[PDB]
RNA sequence: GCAGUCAAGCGUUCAUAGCGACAUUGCUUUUUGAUUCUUCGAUGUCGGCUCUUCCUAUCAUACCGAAGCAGAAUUCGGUAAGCGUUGGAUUGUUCACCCACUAAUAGGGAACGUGAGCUGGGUUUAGACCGUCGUGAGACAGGUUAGUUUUACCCUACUGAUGAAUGUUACCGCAAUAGUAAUUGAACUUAGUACGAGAGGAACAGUUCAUUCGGAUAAUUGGUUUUUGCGGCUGUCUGAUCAGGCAUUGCCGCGAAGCUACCAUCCGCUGGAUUAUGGCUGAACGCCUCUAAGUCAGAAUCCAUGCUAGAACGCGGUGAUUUC
RNA sequence: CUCUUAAGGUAGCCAAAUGCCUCGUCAUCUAAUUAGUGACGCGCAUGAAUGGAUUAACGAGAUUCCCACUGUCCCUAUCUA
RNA sequence: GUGAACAGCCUCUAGUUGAUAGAAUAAUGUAGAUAAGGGAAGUCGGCAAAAUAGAUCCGUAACUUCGGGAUAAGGAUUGGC
C-alpha cells in the first residue's frame, strides 16, 4: 500500500514472493505481471519479501505490448490463489493470482476488470472497486 | 450467525467450519470439509457419489 | 570480524533456564496489591482445562472496519469445580523476607485431602492429622491461642483451598493444595472470613465475573528432549552439509575459550512453568443449571459439551470459566486463573462481550451435528434404531 | 594406506604450498 | 583512517550560521609497510554459509541544543549501543557498481571470530591446451580445464537429567543470587487548521491496523498416514466363489487421533531515580548568573513492579513418626 | 621517402583456451549482468601441415538462455525402517 | 504366468530359514518418503530431487557431407465385457 490507501488492511496470508509470476486483469495490453518487490515490507534477513491480496507491488511485464516491457510499473494485487482466513471465519481463495497496472497515487491504466475482485482490495483502493464488475 | 449448504455434498456448513471457493467467471462454491472440497477438484459428479443429498433424491432415498 | 549482516537474536534470553518445572502444579509467584477498602475476596482460583471450542460474538469495536459485525473467536474451557477451605496461614514482614509463622487446620478433612500426604495410602493407616483433631476436642482454646497470633502478627494472610477431584471425570482421586491471598482490609476479619469458611465450599462466580480480565498460570505441555531446530528456531543447514543439518554450525569464537550461556543448544522443550495475562472472561457456566451451551440468540437446549464429549477429558457437568484465546498447559492439567494485577483501560477490556452461538460439534472429527435431535432430524431413521 | 587418512595430495587440503 | 589548535579569507554586508588556506598538536591498529621476537619432529589458508557476543568514531529510532530555521523539508551539535540495519542481477571474490524495498539499509572486533561446523568457487602438487620467452630440458605474482576434506568414546566449558549426607518421612512456602524484551511504521481524526503573498502544509491527545521479535496453543483451516481404518486397481499364488498371501510400507482416493504452520489462533505490565537539557531561589563578584549550598522538571537510560530458575552446605511453617 | 635486414604477417581470425592495459567500446539479452552472444581491431604477445578458416553428425567435455518440472529456497513440518 | 524380452515381479522342482538377542521409540544420524501458495528468488554452478517414459495413430523445423538431424519439437488413444 503506502501512499493512496485509504484506510488500513487486516492481515492476508502471504501467497506471492519475490518473483511469482500472477495473470493481468485489466485491459491495459499486457498478459502477466513479474512480481519483483513489494511496498511496505520488512527487512528480515533470507526472507523473501511476499504480497497479498490488496497489496501494492511493483511488477514488470513479460507477455504483452512491446512498449509495456522493460519498464518498471506498479500493480495491485486483485486475486489469490492461496487460502486466508478472513474476521468473518470463512477460509476463501480464488482459482488464479491476478493483478492490475497503477500508478503510485491508485488510478488504474486500464478501464475494466476481467473475473472477480476480492472484498478487501476493493475497500483500500476506491478506484480498483469502481472499474469491478463483481467483488467475491 | 447463517447457516450455508454445501453444494457439493449438501450437508450444513456452521460458522467456520469448511472452506468456501471461487470459480474464475463469478461462481462461489462452499464445502463443509476437505472430503467434499478433494471431490469437487477431482471432477467428480456429485450424482454418483452414495452419500450425497442430490444422490438420494434422484435416487428416491429417504422420502 | 562482523557478522556478515545483522540478525535478531534466536529466542528469549528471559525464559532461561529451559528445565524441568518442579512441580506439576505452578507456583503463583505475584498476587494482586491488597485494597483495605474492597470486602474480603479470593484472589485466584484453581481449575482444570477441559478443552477449546468456537464463538460467534458481535464486535463492539468503534473505528474498526468489524463493527455491528459477527465474528469468531477460539475459547478455552476449564472445569471449575467448587474448592474447599482447609486452613489459613499468616506472614509477618521480615528484613529477610517473608515468612510463615502459624498455620492452622480445619478440625475435619476430606479424603481427597489426606490423599495428597501419602504415596502409599493403600498401604497406610491413614493416621494423618489424627492427633491434630484432639486440639478441637477441648473448649477451643488450642485454636484460638494459635488463630489470635494471627491476628497480632502475621500482616500478610493467606488461605488454604483445595480441589474437589471426584467432581471431575479424572481418574487421579488426589485433591491438589494450595495457597490463595485473601486481599480485603482490617487483618483480623481476614482471619475471621477463613474461621467461619472452614470445611465451606465457595463457588467460581465469587471471585470472577462476566468481561473481566484475568491471568492464566499453568505448566506448558511437554515433549521430552529436543534438537536445536525446534527449540530453538534457527535456520537449517543446506542440503549438503556433512554430518547432519539440524544443528548450529558455529557455537563460538575461539576467544573466550568456552561456550557462552546465549548460544543455542539442544535440551529439554516444554513442561515449563508460563504465566499469560490479559485474557477476557466470556462466559461464567453454573454446574446445576441445564443448558448451559445455550445463548439469548440461540435458544436451543444444550449444554458446552461436544458431541461424545470433550475429547480425552470427558463430560462438564460443574461450574466452568470460558477464557478467549488459548491457555498454556494440555487437557487434564491443573491450572490456576488469577485477576490482573493492573487496572487496564486500554478500550480491549472494558467492553461488554454478548455471545451468538457456542459450536457444540463433535471434536472427534469433522462434526456436522450440534445436538443428537439434529443428527436425527438430518439423516431420518436409521436400520439400527427402526 | 587405503582410500582413508589423506594427507598427501590434495585439492584444497593440508600439504600445499 | 580519524580528531583538535591558530584564523589569513569565503560566506551579498558579517572570520568561527556554516566552511576555511598557510602552519602546527595528537589519536587509532579495521589499510599497507618496516622489523624477524615466538612456531618449519606442522597452530589446517581466501571467500561464502551458519551462530553468539562486544566496541562507538551514531545510519535509523528516543529526548534536546543551534541555523542566513515562516511552515514543510534539511543541515550541524549534545546525551546516548536500549533496539534495528534488507531482498536481488554480475564477479570465487573481499572490495565495487546498479535494480528495488525500507524509519534506516552505520563502521568495526573476537588467532584478518567460526573447516574433528559446512562448502571447495579462488590460490598452491601430479594430467592437458594457448600466448610470449629459452637452442633445449623448461619458465611466466599470464590465461584455461580436471583433480580422496580423516578421528571425539577423553578432560573442561555449555545444554538438559539424577543424586549420598544434615533423626526419618510427607505437604505447604519464603527469596539470597542470576537472567529479562519488546520493536517500528501507516491510516483515520486533529485539519486543508496553525504558518505563508501564493505555492504548499504540520504537531500533542484519541482511535484502528501493520512491520520485525518473543511466549504459548490446535476450536477452525492447511500439511503429514503404519490407524496399514475403509474403499478401489495391477501381476502372481491358495481349484473356483468367498477370504487372503507376496510385490524390501505394491499403487491410488479418502482418512480420525497425534504432531505441526505468521500456511492457523491468542497474548506480550507500570512506578521511581537520572544523562543531555530547560528552570527556581541565590551568592561568589554590592550588580548579574540553572550552581557554588539547596531545589524542580526531565531520554528507547538505570533501578524496581512483573516474568524465569530456586543456593542441590540459605531458611520457615505444618502433618505422621514403627514393640516381635 | 627511408633505416636495418634473409625476408617484413599474405589469405583468414580475435579481448577467442591466445588482450598486460580491461569490468576495452557499441549493440542485444535482464527491473538491475565483470557472465553470454553479435560486432569494432596499431592484435602487450592472432595466423597458415607449430597447420589457418569453415563444418553436418557425434560427446558421462567446457558454458549462456528459455519451456516444463520440482522443499535448492521463502520456511520448515510430518512419517517409516 | 505377465511382457517384445535370459528385464522387473509371483510360483513349481531343488535348496536354505544361517548374519549375537531382548526392551523401549529422546535428540542427532543413515536409508526411504510426502508436502499448501510461490517456482531457481537457493547455489561458484538446476548439485540433488522432481517431471518425461511402453504401445498405436497424427504431426515433425533450421541445417546437412543428402546418408542424417528424428523418438525432432508437438498432440490424441489405452480397462472390462
Redesign the interface.
Known amino acids: 500500500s503506502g501512499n493512496g490507501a485509504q484506510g488500513t488492511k487486516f492481515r492476508i496470508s502471504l501467497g506471492l514472493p519475490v518473483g511469482a509470476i500472477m495473470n493481468c486483469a485489466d485491459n491495459s495490453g499486457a498478459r502477466n505481471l513479474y512480481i519483483i518487490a513489494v511496498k511496505g515490507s520488512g527487512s528480515r534477513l533470507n526472507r523473501l519479501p511476499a504480497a497479498s491480496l490488496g497489496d501494492m507491488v511493483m511488477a514488470t511485464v513479460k507477455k504483452g505490448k512491446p512498449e509495456l516491457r522493460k519498464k518498471v510499473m506498479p500493480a495491485i494485487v486483485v486475486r489469490q490463489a492461496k487460502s486466508w482466513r478472513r474476521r468473518d471465519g470463512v477460509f476463501l481463495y480464488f482459482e488464479d493470482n491476478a493483478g492490475v497496472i497503477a500508478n503510485p497515487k491508485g488510478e488504474m491504466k486500464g478501464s475494466a476488470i476481467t473475473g472477480p475482485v476480492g472484498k478487501e482490495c476493493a475497500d483500500l483502493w476506491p478506484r480498483v472497486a469502481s472499474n469491478s464488475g463483481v467483488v467475491v | 450467525?447463517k447457516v450455508e449448504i454445501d453444494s457439493f455434498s449438501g450437508?450444513?456448513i456452521?460458522?467456520?467450519?469448511?472452506?468456501?471457493?471461487?470459480?474464475?467467471?463469478?461462481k462461489?462454491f462452499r464445502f463443509?470439509?476437505?472430503?467434499s472440497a478433494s471431490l469437487f477438484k477431482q471432477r467428480k459428479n456429485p450424482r454418483r457419489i452414495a452419500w450425497t443429498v442430490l444422490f438420494r433424491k434422484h435416487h428416491k432415498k429417504?422420502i | 570480524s562482523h557478522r556478515k549482516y545483522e540478525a535478531p537474536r534466536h529466542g528469549h534470553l528471559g525464559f532461561l533456564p529451559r528445565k524441568r518445572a518442579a512441580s506439576i502444579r505452578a507456583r503463583v509467584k505475584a498476587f494482586p496489591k491488597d485494597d483495605r477498602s474492597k470486602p474480603v475476596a479470593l484472589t485466584s482460583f484453581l481449575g482444570y482445562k477441559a478443552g477449546m471450542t468456537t464463538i460467534v460474538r458481535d464486535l463492539d469495536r468503534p473505528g474498526s472496519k468489524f463493527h455491528k459485525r459477527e465474528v469468531v473467536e477460539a475459547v478455552t474451557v476449564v472445569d471449575t469445580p467448587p474448592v474447599v477451605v482447609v486452613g489459613v496461614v499468616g506472614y509477618v514482614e521480615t528484613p529477610r523476607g517473608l515468612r510463615s509463622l502459624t498455620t492452622v487446620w480445619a478440625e475435619h478433612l476430606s479424603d481427597e485431602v489426606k490423599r495428597r500426604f501419602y504415596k502409599n495410602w493403600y498401604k497406610s493407616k491413614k493416621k494423618a492429622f489424627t492427633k491434630y483433631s484432639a486440639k478441637y476436642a477441648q473448649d477451643g482454646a488450642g485454636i484460638e491461642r494459635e488463630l489470635a497470633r494471627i491476628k497480632k502478627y502475621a500482616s500478610v494472610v493467606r488461605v488454604l483451598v483445595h480441589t474437589q477431584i471426584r467432581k471431575t471425570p479424572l481418574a487421579q482421586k488426589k485433591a491438589h493444595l494450595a495457597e490463595i491471598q485473601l486481599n480485603g482490609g482490617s487483618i483480623s476479619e481476614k482471619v475471621d472470613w477463613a474461621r467461619e469458611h472452614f470445611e465451606k465450599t465457595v463457588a467460581v462466580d465469587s471471585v470472577f465475573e462476566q468481561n473481566e480480565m484475568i491471568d492464566a498460570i499453568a505448566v506448558t505441555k511437554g515433549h521430552g528432549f529436543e534438537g536445536v531446530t525446534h527449540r530453538w528456531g534457527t535456520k537449517k543447514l543446506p542440503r549438503k552439509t556433512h554430518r547432519g543439518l539440524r544443528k548450529v554450525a558455529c557455537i563460538g569464537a575461539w576467544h573466550p575459550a568456552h561456550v557462552m550461556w546465549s548460544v543455542a543448544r539442544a535440551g529439554q522443550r516444554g513442561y515449563h512453568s508460563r504465566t499469560s495475562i490479559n485474557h477476557k472472561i466470556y462466559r461464567v457456566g453454573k454446574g446445576d443449571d441445564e443448558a448451559n451451551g445455550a445463548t439469548s440468540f440461540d435458544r436451543t437446549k444444550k449444554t458446552i459439551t461436544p458431541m461424545g464429549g470433550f475429547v480425552h477429558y470427558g463430560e462438564i457437568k460443574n461450574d466452568f470459566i470460558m477464557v478467549k484465546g488459548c491457555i498454556p498447559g494440555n487437557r487434564k492439567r491443573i491450572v490456576t486463573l488469577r485477576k490482573s494485577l493492573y487496572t487496564n483501560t486500554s478500550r480491549k477490556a472494558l467492553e461488554e462481550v454478548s455471545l451468538k452461538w457456542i459450536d457444540t460439534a463433535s471434536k472427534f472429527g469433522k462434526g456436522r451435528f450440534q445436538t443428537p435431535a439434529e443428527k436425527h432430524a438430518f439423516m431420518g431413521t436409521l436400520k439400527k434404531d427402526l | 594406506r587405503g582410500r582413508g587418512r589423506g594427507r598427501g595430495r590434495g585439492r584444497g587440503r593440508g600439504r600445499g604450498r
Not at chain 2, 32 to 35: D, E, L, V
Open positions: 450467525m450437508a450444513k456452521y460458522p467456520g467450519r469448511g472452506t468456501l471457493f471461487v470459480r474464475g467467471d463469478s462461489i463443509q470439509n476437505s472430503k429417504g
